[PDB]
Amino acid sequence: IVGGKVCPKGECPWQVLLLVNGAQLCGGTLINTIWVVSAAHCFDKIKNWRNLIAVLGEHDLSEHDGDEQSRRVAQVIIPSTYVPGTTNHDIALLRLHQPVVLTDHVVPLCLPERTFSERTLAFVRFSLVSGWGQLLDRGATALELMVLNVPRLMTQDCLQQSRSPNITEYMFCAGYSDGSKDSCKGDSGGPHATHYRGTWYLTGIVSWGQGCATVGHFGVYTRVSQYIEWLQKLMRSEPRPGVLLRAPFP
Amino acid sequence: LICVNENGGCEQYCSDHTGTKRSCRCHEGYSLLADGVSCTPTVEYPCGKIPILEKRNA
Ligand SMILES: CS(=O)(=O)N(CC(N)=O)c1cccc(CC(=O)Nc2ccc3nc(N)[nH]c3c2)c1
Ligand SMILES: [Ca+2]
Ligand SMILES: [Cl-]
Ligand SMILES: [Cl-]
Numbered sequence: 001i002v003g004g005k006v007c008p009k010g011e012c013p014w015q016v017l018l019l020v021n022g023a024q025l026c027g028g029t030l031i032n033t034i035w036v037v038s039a040a041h042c043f044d045k046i047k048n049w050r051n052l053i054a055v056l057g058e059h060d061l062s063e064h065d066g067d068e069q070s071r072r073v074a075q076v077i078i079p080s081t082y083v084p085g086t087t088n089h090d091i092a093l094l095r096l097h098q099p100v101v102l103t104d105h106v107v108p109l110c111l112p113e114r115t116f117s118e119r120t121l122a123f124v125r126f127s128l129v130s131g132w133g134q135l136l137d138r139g140a141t142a143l144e145l146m147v148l149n150v151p152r153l154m155t156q157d158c159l160q161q162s163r164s165p166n167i168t169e170y171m172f173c174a175g176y177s178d179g180s181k182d183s184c185k186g187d188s189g190g191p192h193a194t195h196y197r198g199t200w201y202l203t204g205i206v207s208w209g210q211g212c213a214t215v216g217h218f219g220v221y222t223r224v225s226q227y228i229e230w231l232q233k234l235m236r237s238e239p240r241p242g243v244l245l246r247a248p249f250p
Numbered sequence: 251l252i253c254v255n256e257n258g259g260c261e262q263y264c265s266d267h268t269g270t271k272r273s274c275r276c277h278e279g280y281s282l283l284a285d286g287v288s289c290t291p292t293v294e295y296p297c298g299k300i301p302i303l304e305k306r307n308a
Binding site: 008010011013031081102103104106107108109110111112113115119190196197198199200244 | 268
């Protein structure tokens with residue numbers, strides 16, 4: 001995250017850290033005790049699918065304070081329409097091997113109904129994006145979880161204001177074009193969380209952008225509203241052997 | 251009332267029904283109050299609420 005602030009410990013309790021052989025991979029969002037939403041592109045280069053770990057309740061990567069909970073990732077589910085090396089359909093649903101325990105520091109973000117998300121949440125101007133990604137373009141990643149308030153653009157306005165992948169109906173733009181504030185590499189997969197009448201909801205996944213905080217460009221987010229029914233059906237399904245699962249979309 | 255305008259007055263989810271009818275609904279871990287619009291937690295850690303902040307103003 002560029003130009004944000006430290007998320008006070010426990011104020012981003014849905015944030016997930018994904019590790020591969022102990023190394024930072026990506027962010028994610030807890031939506032239930034066994035389910036995490038992340039970005040499909042995070043998994044393009046995974047060689048050993050059995051060494052993926054999700055950490056909940058993380059805050060400061062330099063220390064162990066006892067609020068962290070680690071789980072093996074049992075399943076990574078990606079839409080059939082996602083193509084490795086590209087940006088469209090950038091979503092993954094992760095099943096944890098055992099539930100996390102909900103605590104003051106570990107709480108799911110609400111996965112909204114589609115209608116609600118499209119008709120109401122899509123018009124809330126500002127939402128929060130968070131992660132342990134790079135603090136600057138070409139810079140070091142953060143040791144403490146960072147958070148940033150970003151405004152959402154209608155896609156017509158993003159294309160107009162921006163000056164190369166298309167912005168598809170499975171994406172939306174958010175952020176600033178003045179080079180000051182943005183999500184960045186290493187924040188991929190993390191939440192774009194939207195507040196409405198006292199409750200927070202998952203509306204986007206940190207997906208891509210032209211550099212980070214690049215003048216004339218905005219961050220691009222996976223438009224989670226397009227995937228609600230796809231996610232809900234998968235969460236009702238039995239697990240299948242083998243970590244990676246490609247599931248038909250729609 | 252209609253779900254497209256002002257979320258049908260619902261705090262959370264809204265369904266339109268035949269005639270001038272509307273039903274609000276709440277996420278798992280919440281219940282709908284008698285006002286027909288408000289949702290109140292039914293569990294200790296409902297989704298989308300931040301415990302340290304909910305305790306700070308309780
Ligand atoms: C090139 S590829 O399509 O092949 N692929 C590689 C791969 N094989 O995974 C890939 C796909 C999507 C994103 C990325 C990196 C990326 O853009 N991160 C990022 C995240 C958030 C951001 N916010 C801003 N403002 N910029 C951001 C940048 C790589
Ligand atoms: Ca820690
Ligand atoms: Cl099934
Ligand atoms: Cl496997």
